[PDB]
Structure formats: C-alpha cells, structure tokens
Design a binder for these strands. Sequence first.
RNA 1: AUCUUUAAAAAUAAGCCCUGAAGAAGGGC
Lengths: 85, 100, 425, 139, 61
Amino acid sequence: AAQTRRRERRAEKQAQWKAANPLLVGVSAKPVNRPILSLNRKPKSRVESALNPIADLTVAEYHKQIESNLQRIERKNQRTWYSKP
Amino acid sequence: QRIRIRLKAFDHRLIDQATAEIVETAKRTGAQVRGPIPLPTRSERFTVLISPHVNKDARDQYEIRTHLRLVDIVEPTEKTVDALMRLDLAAGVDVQISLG
Amino acid sequence: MNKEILAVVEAVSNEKALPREKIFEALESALATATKKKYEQEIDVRVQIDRKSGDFDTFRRWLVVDEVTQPTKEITLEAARYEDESLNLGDYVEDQIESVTFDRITTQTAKQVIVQKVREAERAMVVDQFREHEGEIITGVVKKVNRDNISLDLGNNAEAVILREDMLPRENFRPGDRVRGVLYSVRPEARGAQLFVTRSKPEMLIELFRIEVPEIGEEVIEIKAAARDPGSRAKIAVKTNDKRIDPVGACVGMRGARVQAVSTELGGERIDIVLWDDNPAQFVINAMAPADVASIVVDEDKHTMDIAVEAGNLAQAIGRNGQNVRLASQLSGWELNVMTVDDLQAKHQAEAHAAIDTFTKYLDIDEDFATVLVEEGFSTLEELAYVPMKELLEIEGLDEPTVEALRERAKNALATIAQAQQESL
Amino acid sequence: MEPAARRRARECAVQALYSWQLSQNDIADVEYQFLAEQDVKDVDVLYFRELLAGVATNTAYLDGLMKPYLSRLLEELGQVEKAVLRIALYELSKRSDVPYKVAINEAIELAKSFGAEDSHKFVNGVLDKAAPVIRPNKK
Amino acid sequence: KPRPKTLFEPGEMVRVNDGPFADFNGVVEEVDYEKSRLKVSVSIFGRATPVELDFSQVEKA
RNA sequence: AUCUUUAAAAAUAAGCCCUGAAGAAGGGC
C-alpha cells in the first residue's frame, strides 16, 4: 500500500516513455479464466444429490470399507500364517 | 429424551429454510417431530454511526427486528445426533440448543 | 500345486459384494498375456475359467475380418459359416487348445496380478467417493502437521490433507479443530487415498455463498464468475433469472451481512457483489467498481479492451498493486488496459498517424487520401476493402470511378504486399 | 362482539398451523402434541379445533381462493403469511357466524407483529382483491 | 518448552468426548447437580452453542 | 383492538529502499 510509491516518484521517466511509445499503456496479464465459470455452478443438482440436510447423513463415507479390506490381506497372510517360507 | 432446539435469526428466509432442514432431518433419521412453533418478532435498535458528527446525515440508525422459533424431539438415536452434528448450519442464525 | 492361491484369493475377495467377476477378467488378461511371448508372431488367446472342479480349459481365438492383413489370423468370413452359423462378424470362433492342469510355474504372475487388481479396485471405490462428494463442504479434525501439509479426520477415520499454496497465506493450526473445504480435483498421488482440502481456491468462497444464500438452493439468482485474492479482496458475479429480483440485494442481506459473515469466515476478505450482463462491454463497466468508467474501446480477435478513467480515482480504478485491474482482468474474459483520458487521446492520435504511416508504406498519392483517412477510417486496409454501398453513401461526387480506384489500389496493394511479406512458404 | 380468548385463539392457531405445515404429520397428531405445551389458557378451543379441522381437511378449493392472487404473484411463500392467508381464506369462506372485518383486522395487526419483514401492506393488498371472491354478498 | 498443552478445543476450557459434540468444549454456565447436567457452550462455526451434557460425557476444567 | 395497499446494500488490512516505463519482472533489510 505505502510502498510502490517510488514508481509514482518516477512518473517523468514514464512520461518520456509515453512521449516515445504512445501506443503502449499499462497492461495486465490474464490467467485461468475458462474453468472458473463452470466450477462456479452445478447450479443446484450437486446439493440435490448432496442436499445439505439429508445427503451427508445418508451418504457419508463409502470407500472406508474398501481401504480396511485392502491392506489387511497382505497383512493377513503374514500376521496369520506366521513368521515361521 | 430431549434435545430441545431454539433458533434465533435476523432474516426470515434463513430460519424458515433452516427449520425446514432440521424437520426434514428429524423425519429422515427415524425420529418424531415436536413442533415447530413461532414466537413474536422482538424489535431492537442499536445506533451505529460509521461516520463523523452525530445527526447531519438524516438517515436511519440501523434498526432491525428479530425472528425466532423453537422445535423439540423425543427419543432419538445416534444416527440423529451425528446426523445433526455432520449437518452444516448456515451463518447469521443463532442456535440455542438443549440436551438431556 | 496352488491349490492355495484360489483359497487365499477367495479369502481376499467378496469385500465389496462382488466375489468372482473382477478376477474372472483378471485371469483372462492374466493368462492371455502369458502365451503372447512364447509364440512369437501374433497369437491372441482367451480362456474359460471354472472355479468348481479346478480344471481350466483354454480356447483358440482367431480374428474374423474380411481381408487377411497379417497371415493365419483371419478366418475369412465364408469359412466361419461352416463350423458354427451362430458365429458372426465381430466375435471369434472357439477351437480347443490342449492344456489341463492348475498350471505349471510361473504360478506367481497370478499372485501380483491379484495384487494389482485389488489396488485398482480400491482406486475404483475411492473414485466412487470422489463422485459422491465433489463438490461439497465437509470438515474434519486435525491429526498431524508435517511442516508443509497437515492431516485431517473427516469422521470415520477419513483422512484428508491440505497443501501450502492451497491455504490462506497466514493460517494457524491446533491439533483438534475443524476447517471446511471443497474437494477438489483428483490426484492419487501414490498408492492410497489422499484428499487435498481447499480454502484458497474460488470454489470455497462459492460454496460458502451456496450455503449462505438460500436462493442458490432455489435457483432464483445465478452466479457466473469468481475472481479472488485469498486474504485481501474478491469479485464474484451474479445474475437473476426473473428480472424483478435484485441479485445484489439478495447477496448482501441485512445489515452487511452475508458478505460480512462469509468475509469473516475467510479473514479480511473483501467481497464485491457485481451484476452479470450479456453484453461483454458493460459487464466490464460493472466489474471495474468502484471506478467511474469514461469510455471503453473493445478490441476483438485477441480478447482485449482499453479503459479510460477521468480523474482522482485512477489508483482506485487500478487498485493498490494492480488489484482492481487484475481481479477485473480475471472476472470477465477480456484483457484490460487502464489509462487516462489524455493517454487515450494520445492513443487515438498515435493510431491515426500510425495507420497513415503504414499507408505510406503503400503507394500513397497526395494529401486528400490522408484526409479520407482522418475523416473515414476504416483502418487496416478497409478490412479487405469490403464495405457496402459507397461507404454507406458518402458524398464527394465520384460515384463509380474513384471508389473503384481505391478498391483497385486497395485489393492490389494487399494482394501484392501481403503475399510479399505476410504470406510464408 | 367476541371475547378476547378468540383473539388469543388465533394467536395459538398460527403457531399450531405452522407446526402442521412444517412437520407434515397427521393433524390430530400435531394438535395432540400442541395442546400440552401452551400456558396462555384463554383460548376458545371450539373455534380452534374448528379452524384446524377446516384447514386440515381442505383441499383443491383454498388454492383456488388464492389462485387469482398467485396468478399475480410468484408462487412463493412466506410461511407465516401462508398460515395467515390460509386461515384468512378459511374464515372468509366459512364464517357467516362471526362478523367480517374483525378477523381481517386483528389478523393483519397480528400478522404485522408476528410475520415477516413488512407483511401488512402485503396482506392489505391481498384481501381487497380477495373481497370480490366467490362469496358474493359482502355482508 | 515447545509450548503445547492441548487437551484443548475452541471452548474455554473443558473436554467433551461423547455424542455429537465430542472433541469440543465450553463452560458450564449453570451447574445442575440435582439434574446431573452441565450446560456447555460449544464454539462451532464461530458461535457459542450452549448444550447440556453429563458428567461422564465431559471432563471438568 | 372491525382495513396500516404487493417486502431490506456491504470492504475502513498488508513494513522500508534499488534496477526498470511498468500496477511485466526480480533484488536487497
């Protein structure tokens, strides 16, 4: 806020450039604009299948079963069979 | 047993929406709904000048009226209480709840 | 032998209510790949596996198309009508290959093709949660802070994570609290299930408006674009479906208050509620707020615009450190250039003499031509010299001949010079 | 011309009618849950049960009464005003017994103090166009 | 002194470990020894939520 | 306690200097 004052101190060095280059002005580059419109909305069907009361209590966590079933078999032959190949 | 729920709000759409959300939740989680009933709109005032000298502006001193409801529930399960726990209530509404 | 791999593999399976119909295909692509290498031309095979008796029978597979591309592969349809008429174009005719045992060693490519299939099935149901909650607001309890990222607990030991640039720039953390987020765009990253929870991406602010404003859950108002700075300032664009509804008045509330509550949720987040227009030019005039726009020349074919502002509010039109011109150069979809009215005047005086000088590159007879350039421009060679009805009936006399002179010199000039310089080999 | 227990009975009636409009249960259930929690007992309960049965059992008729107004307005309520408008459309289509300008006026002074933000110019714009309704006499 | 003592959630100071409001806290502003309830004010969403909880459901500050 | 005419606008925050026309780019304390 306070600093960047030093380029407004150099406004004459800008003025000789505007005298030399009149067709150029202050510029602003331009990023990722294209998916920030589509991810701004479902509009409503995402909180219809998500539906702020009912579909966090009904559909809460569903890969929590598969992850407990996953490691426990390559764990299970070693912890089950025994260290004593 | 109760939980008892009493809600306070400034906007009527958020409290009608929110009570519809809580009653829909209590209907879906298998419990019974007691109420809800409304109560009178209590008015209030609090002078907020965001500006200098006192009353040269000739505009209102930011007055507002307040809506509030209440709803009860008897014999819930654990699905009800973690259901209302997982439910993200909106902001700008006050929740005066009970339990026992 | 092995004789135990089927017992341990019916021990791993039926964990997501489908016991055998993934590992059918796992033994199909498993044993079908093994005979590719021992017979070295092109041999595609399929097996029929049965679980009851243990004996497995493989079957010869030949590709039925019309011509023979590479030899012996093609049954050449008229021969497929003889062995079985029910076999048609598109499927392969079954011939027996003599092999009946459990299997000879290898017997191990089975073991970690099973280890592969359980991991990608794990990936499938992790993608199934990644369908059920993208995008919601959910929140979790902090477990671990590993000095760049952090660990959450979303309930049933649902562990999540948050990056560094994916946060507000100065956040503090205590193990136990809960923070809300939208979730997210999927990386695996390694073999597991991680969930980057965001608070600095725009969808956090957007879904905070979705829970905060109930007219989004009623489809009364409609939000179009969102430009942010995760601790300083935001610009978000709304419209309404019915013209009587004010979406700005719906988004502010009483007294602040929706931008005040969602603002205090995200620190010192300034929120600009702005109306969306179907006009590309007027939505920028709304989006430069609180500036007072004098005039805008919209330049097509590059998505660029030029903005001039009168007096006093120049550093408020651009913003401190270019924030109004950057967020405004993020909301709309057209590049912005903010200047003065005198820099715009020198801009028109620069483009006029620039068009004159680029027409001094052409043949350019006497000063009356440049008077036509100042009066009627029509710059950049009249846009291939295609204008209607005598430049819409300008009067100097000279109805037929002189306009054919300027169109003749125009088309001949752009043809010769544009093929001389602009056209490449 | 009526006791004030009727004027308190409509005040309990918007609260008991809000509970059936929100809870979506049986009406005898919601009055069976309602009658044991209020402690302002000057209530004319025969008009109370008559009105709750009246808006309870009814119908494709009362939305025909508010249908010339929801042709003018968007079909969005306004939940306390849904209660006051439905009880006003029942008492303006059942009550030949009691007079006709009383139950408009204490329910619009009631509806201003109990309803939404402004809620009185709204109903004052409703019931003047709801005066040329099917009841033809203006008695 | 790496300076931690938590054992602490946004309320001031208790430890609730049961039901919905587990890993949260507050103050029992009105103590009910006869009813065996403690009216604890949970700071959820930046907002106090005074909820009545048992002695075994909380841990006293 | 027998008429009161179709619903309400918000940010006050980011330390000090050099190169550069830059509110493009980087450096220092």
